[PDB]
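Thread: Modeling a multi-component assembly for a lab meeting

Hi all, long-time lurker, first post. My supervisor asked me to bring a structural picture of a complex we are working on to next week's group meeting, and I have zero experience with this. I have the sequence lines for every component (1344 residues in total). Could someone generate the structure of the whole assembly? Inputs are pasted exactly as I received them:
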Amino acid sequence: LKERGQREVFCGLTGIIWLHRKMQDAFFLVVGSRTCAHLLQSAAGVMIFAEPRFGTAVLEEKDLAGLADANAELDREVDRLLARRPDIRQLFLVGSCPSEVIKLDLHRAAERLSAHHGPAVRVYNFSGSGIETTFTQGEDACLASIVPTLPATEARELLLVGALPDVVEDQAVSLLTQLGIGPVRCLPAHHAAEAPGVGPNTVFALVQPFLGDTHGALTRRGARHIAAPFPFGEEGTTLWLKAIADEFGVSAETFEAVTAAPRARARKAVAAASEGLRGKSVFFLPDSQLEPSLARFLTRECGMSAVEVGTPFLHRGILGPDLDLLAEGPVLSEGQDVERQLDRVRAARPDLTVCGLGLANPLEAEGFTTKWAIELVFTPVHFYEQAGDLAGLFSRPVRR
Amino acid sequence: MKLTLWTYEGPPHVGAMRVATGMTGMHYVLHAPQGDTYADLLFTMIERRGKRPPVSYTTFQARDLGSDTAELFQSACRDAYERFQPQAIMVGSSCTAELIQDDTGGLADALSLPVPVVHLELPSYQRKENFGADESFLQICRKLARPMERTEKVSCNLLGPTALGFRHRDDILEVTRLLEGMGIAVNAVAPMGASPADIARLGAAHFNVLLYPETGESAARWAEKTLKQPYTKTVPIGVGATRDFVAEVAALAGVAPVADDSRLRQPWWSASVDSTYLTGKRVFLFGDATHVIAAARVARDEMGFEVVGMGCYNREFARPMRAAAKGYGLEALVTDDYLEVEEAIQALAPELILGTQMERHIAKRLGIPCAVISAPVHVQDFPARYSPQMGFEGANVLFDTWIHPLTMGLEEHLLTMFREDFEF
Amino acid sequence: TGAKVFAVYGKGGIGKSTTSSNLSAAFSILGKRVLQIGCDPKHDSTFTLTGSLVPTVIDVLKDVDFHPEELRPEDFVFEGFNGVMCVEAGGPPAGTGCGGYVVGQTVKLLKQHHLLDDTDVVIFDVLGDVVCGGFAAPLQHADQAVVVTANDFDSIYAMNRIIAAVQAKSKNYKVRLAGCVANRSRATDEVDRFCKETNFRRLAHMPDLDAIRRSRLKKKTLFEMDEDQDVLAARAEYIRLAESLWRGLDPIDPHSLPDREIFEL
Amino acid sequence: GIGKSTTSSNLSAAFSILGKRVLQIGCDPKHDSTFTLTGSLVPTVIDVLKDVDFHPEELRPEDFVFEGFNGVMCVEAGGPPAGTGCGGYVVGQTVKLLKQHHLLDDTDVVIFDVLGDVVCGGFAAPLQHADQAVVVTANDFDSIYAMNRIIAAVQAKSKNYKVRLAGCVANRSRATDEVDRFCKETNFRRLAHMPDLDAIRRSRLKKKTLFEMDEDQDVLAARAEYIRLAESLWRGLDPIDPHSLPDREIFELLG
Ligand code: PMR
Ligand code: SF4
Ligand SMILES: [Cu+2]
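Re: Modeling a multi-component assembly
Sure thing. I ran the full set together rather than chain by chain. Output:
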């Protein structure tokens, strides 16, 4: 739904920036052209300067006018890199726009590399091109790549399917064990040691909103989805914890006792950040798909009137839980071309104008106080203890 | 195929985008995949250019991989004409549409837009952004700049400055000050502040001036024949280069070589007794070819630094680079990866390495004093403060920026020396 | 394209080199910007134009790591008489591979450095003696394919060979055989009649073998620097050639005659 | 370039007389080099490909051997049928393919007299077989440069075949002395082979060459020279120290 227009979202490879942070024993070999190489170089920023696992093998002209030579050469370069990087145990080949158009057999390449490399390096392939994906969707694809490989466990386990920082995922696990049993197995494994036992009865806890196809891939293994509004505020977090609890079985008393300290911990912080957001117009442009959750939280807690919650990729079975808390007032429009929502912003002037980084500076110069959603994925604001920090981040009431 | 981690240069369409964003009112419409708009971030943040860069990517997806891409481009051009009303418009493709041939120029002609359209042929797999920029500039000069009457006053065009360029914005101001000081009036700076009207007026000058040969040599060479316009070779970075440049444009125009150097403090501030530890320090210059060559002419001739290394990443400019490397007794490192230069400085261990952002970062990783002189930079290196790199004030800027790492090093060395001795 | 991309084909060392150079000087006299490309591996095509041997593109190209970017104009392209740009392609020194890889690289070089944009006349002095993928490698970019031949039936057989080759290449291109040019041969009665059976246009020439003594009169071509009596008639002939090519003439189309039909006497 | 009519016959007709009759498969797609030993141009040369897109009757059982005056019984070759193909179809795949298509097993001796315009810069199997005859050159600045290229080839074909070489005849169109100094620089041989009344009298050359027309070597005695070159004495020696020169030194003459 771009009306044949400029969809500002990034190609899925930008998700690799934080994925490599999550799975610290995983390398990501991207076969993109110099454009995709420049994208990784830029969007990663300071990542490049500390030996990042961001192989951006550029396919040059010799890789053109030839197919078997290309993936044979790819095999060669991979072997070279594990020679330089023996520590890596899972290599993440990723499909790029150049890789898609030249019809590179990324799956077959990953297969032969795994075969000659063995279980010591379980090289995996997925797709993160802009021809198919859009920013965060890359993380979806990357975790979906490991989903079939993960050990099959028919026992009732919980899956922490999300790349939240340690100071977030550890807190989530601690709370869940505090009220529930917590057979929590984080799907984005910190190391290959913590291989999660995905299975039929291993119901998976979805915690990052942008994860769409993830749902499908995990449900193929039988892993069911909890209809829990996304843990991103006094409503999303509380509802998510509640639903996760009753899914495994937790008394209301135990839930209240466990979440009593976090509840008061975050209520004061969110209020102390909300007065900068008290009664103003918002506008979510389709950058990264957290906007529905952000509207579910901020509109109802900090009193930010919801004008339009744009979304590049709308979902019905995943977004529904937090969709229920969403008011009908905001326009649920999907991700249009930049001109459309830009003109909407100009017409219905919003106080806060959350959008992509590319429009952030112009609309900032165009009299729109802007907060870029790009900051959201890196800054650890996806649980109870950081709900106030999220509100402070959204606040941004800079005066001159 | 080669595993790249930090490409010194973006793809060439980034260079064309730099030229388009530099000048006013020329919409560089693109046949690019959905997501390739990442380049807009560079101009909107690192250059902090307010308005969105005047570029309209078609942003095609899995839905669009056939003739629908051609229809996308058709729309993109007609839209861009009406919505983003230009006086001149570019066409071209990124890597994806380079492979999925769509006859960009043919599409543009199919619209037959009243404003001139500049067909851009940009090989996006064997060349880089410096090329891309030079090629784009050349194509728009041959499409818009036609020979015309010389301005009655002696006048010159600065060619080379380009949006998202290392202190280009300040350097135009400095060179303009110097040229007016001699008496030469600047006819039209292109392509950093020019307009298609200005590119039309290009021919009216008496002689082009090459500030940045990387983005301007092709334009100047074409102007030499089409517009009968000589172009000066000596980029004026540093005191000595400034003197040569002053004399050169003086000869070219016909005006006396008087240039006001009352703001020159570097000859005095480096000849001072304070700057005596700087003599015979080892330096590793890396980065843009012209910047590196002039920085070497400063380091070995006005500062007393001993050049122990030298290297470049502009393969296009390897020949003058190698010539200068012989000039200083060294061997030029005409490479394009950080591994080679990293190994080079590790073997060399110069006191003050300086160059691209990578040079600074792997200086820090190696704990070596670090400065910045070349093109690839981040938002910090793009300053708000007036910091040209050419002219006399450019010489002073070079001085301070280069010895700041040295002063930091000396002061920290002292502080560790002091308050610290054998316990017993 | 953006210029009259001529192709001087036909046989080796008999006219084609001298014909190409003197035609270049003719178009220089006409004033149109001229480009002579010495694709012939003798590295001798432009010698008369510059008065000196030119370092071939292959030489400088190998002087760098086969990187065209390092090279620049005025390093591999050299000027000649009447300000005519002229390049040379150095045929491979038996490096197997492709025998026209160098001429293809020269085309790439000129197009890259925009030498092949402003110029109006481009006469590809390509070796016409042999028929191999590489000799017709720049024939693609060609638009009028001028063939030069002598009265000798060996030269005429070669001429027929050229027709066959260029018809095969033009089966996929709009390049036209501009006309069979005799090369200082004397009586063209045979040549004109052979052209008649092929229906080919027998472009007129200057018959004398000694308008130049040799080496184009010590590198000084007829138009370049020459004031002999027969030089004047030849100069008129070559101006006739130049105007004929520049205006454009009938789309003559020779049918490839079998060798037996060619006078085998 | 040279017609080689004055050579392909008047080198080894006395050899064909001496040993087994030569087959004389000299590359001349103009039908102008080998035919002089035969009675005429004989354009047929079994150019018809009787086998479907293959050499007739696979290995043709010596069904061509056009007879000649001085025990020729040979065949001729030369044709540009394919035309197109860079290193794979025309000069890359010569229509003759291997010479083994013709019964070398039965016609052991063969005379190669290729034109020598450094053809087939790709395919490098032909123009180098046999041990009796090699590329014949002549006397002309372009000719000397071209046969210098032929040298550079055979030096690059040193590992190829048996590098038979043994020298080459510099067909002396006239008394030019440049060939002598040039060969001295290349440490080669030039001797003497004058073509006269051969290209202009071809009505008589078509059937019998100069050493057998009316005994035209009666005033142009050069067959004893060939009895030194060909036949009994063979000029084996060394391969007359071939040494190809690059472009600048092949410009030893004003050229
Ligand atoms: C692809 C272009 C681009 C550039 C220029 C970078 C680096 C950088 N991006 Mg933002 N960034 C781009 C995109 C993205 N950035 C990324 C990273 C990053 C962060 C965490 C931050 C940011 C920002 C910037 C900036 C300006 C501030 C900075 O250098 O940190 C650069 C050059 C900066 C910000 O948005 O404003 C304060 C900030 O704190 N980006 C990510 C998220 C994975 C992507 C997709
Ligand atoms: S056809 Fe020509 S270019 Fe191709 S390999 Fe043979 S000689 Fe070389
Ligand atoms: Cu500091």
